[PDB]
Amino acid sequence: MASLLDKAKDFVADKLTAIPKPEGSVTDVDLKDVNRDSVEYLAKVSVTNPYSHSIPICEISFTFHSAGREIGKGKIPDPGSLKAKDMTALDIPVVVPYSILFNLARDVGVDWDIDYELQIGLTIDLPVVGEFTIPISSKGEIKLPTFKDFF
């Protein structure tokens, strides 16, 4: 388990182990482009660090789903050095292959409004566990992407 990253002593023994879990990397997701091959989404992240010190580096591992299939996924080590036991804004590129939206917006855009779920694994390099991975989710229903005969 990630909470037992190396058996060291120093300060610990039965005191301390790792961080809680309700610590974030979510806040907003802005869908945009596609061209004709791949739709793009700019994800505004808000990473909440559970330790009173600006951490150095993190991992945003995102698995997005729309209808109930997927939207896209990926893992990126990003310098999530930040405030201190608080929430910091972070950024994700733009990833949703047109083929996927093609399926979901096909069916639910057959209606019009679809949901979008983020499954984001939060790996953050911390002083407590040295690094820890806890996942979290952010679903949001909004009008489907810009279209005409794309879906």
Side-chain angles (χ1 to χ4, degrees):
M1 189 171 296
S3 40
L4 288 309
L5 203 291
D6 190 83
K7 284 192 73 289
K9 254 295 301 175
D10 284 276
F11 310 99
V12 303
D14 76 288
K15 295 175 295 188
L16 296 180
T17 306
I19 71 173
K21 194 182 189 301
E23 278 64 64
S25 285
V26 297
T27 171
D28 198 272
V29 177
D30 186 70
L31 191 284
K32 46 218 53 205
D33 214 270
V34 59
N35 165 38
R36 76 248 300 210
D37 293 89
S38 199
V39 181
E40 287 182 312
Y41 81 88
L42 205 305
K44 181 58 68 182
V45 166
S46 276
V47 184
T48 312
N49 163 31
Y51 198 78
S52 55
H53 286 98
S54 315
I55 39 172
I57 275 80
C58 312
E59 177 181 63
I60 20 78
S61 168
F62 40 89
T63 308
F64 264 100
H65 311 198
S66 189
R69 46 205 73 217
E70 59 280 282
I71 270 296
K73 82 285 181 290
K75 299 188 175 186
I76 303 176
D78 184 270
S81 178
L82 34 53
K83 304 184 176 303
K85 73 206 315 304
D86 202 87
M87 191 183 296
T88 210
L90 179 142
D91 287 278
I92 306 304
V94 278
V95 62
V96 40
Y98 175 37
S99 304
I100 320 302
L101 246 164
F102 189 78
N103 283 270
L104 51 104
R106 169 196 339 184
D107 179 84
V108 200
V110 124
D111 169 78
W112 52 288
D113 191 87
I114 317 83
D115 184 85
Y116 290 75
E117 179 210 69
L118 166 54
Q119 199 78 152
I120 180 75
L122 273 43
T123 302
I124 48 181
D125 196 280
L126 292 151
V128 187
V129 219
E131 70 182 70
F132 197 58
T133 306
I134 45 90
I136 187 259
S137 326
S138 190
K139 323 169 73 279
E141 319 176 325
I142 73 292
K143 309 182 190 307
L144 52 72
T146 192
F147 72 119
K148 176 176 295 183
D149 203 88
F150 299 85
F151 291 91

